[PDB]
């Protein structure tokens, strides 16, 4: 039973990153598209396009590789998995690798990064890291 879709999306990104090819096909929905836009404007993704007929997605992911076959996104893991929910206040917001990565926080205004979160004094639920 597919009891969490977000972890499926993140493991699909890691499995596509590990064996090093360029495309990815995800049966998708609204929160997946929103974190895709977060990563796109933060540039961990090279590009995205959107193809939907009537059903889950799909979002096609155009991964990013370096100019000498190196990989720019190195790990990716969830925080508030369904069963142990995790909530972080506005002055407990983490700063990963001394700010070298980012973190996805579903604030009360929506889904933003950590810098925009600390620039508004809003905590919220942390979805996942990426660095």
């Amino acid at each position: 039973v597919m009891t969490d879709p977000i972890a499926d999306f993140l493991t699909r990104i890691r499995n596509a990153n590990m064996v090093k090819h360029e495309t990815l096909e995800v049966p998708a929905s609204k929160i997946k598209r929103d974190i895709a836009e977060i990563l796109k404007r933060e540039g961990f993704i090279r590009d995205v396009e959107y193809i939907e007929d009537d059903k889950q997605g799909v979002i096609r992911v155009f991964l990013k590789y370096g100019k000498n076959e190196e990989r720019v996104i190195t790990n990716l893991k969830r925080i508030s998995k369904p069963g142990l929910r995790a909530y972080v206040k506005a002055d407990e917001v983490p700063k990963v690798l001394n700010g070298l990565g980012i973190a996805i926080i579903s604030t009360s205004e929506g889904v933003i990064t950590d810098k925009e979160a600390r620039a508004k004094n809003i905590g919220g639920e942390v979805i996942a890291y990426v660095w």
């Binding site: 933060e42 961990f44 700010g99 070298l100």
Partner: peptide, 19 residues
């Protein structure tokens, strides 16, 4: 162990918006 200029130069963005 990574490096500041590396990660700032990898993605299409620049340094000083990530510090």
């Amino acid at each position: 162990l990574k490096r500041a200029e590396e990660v700032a130069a990898l993605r299409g963005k620049s340094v000083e918006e990530i510090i």
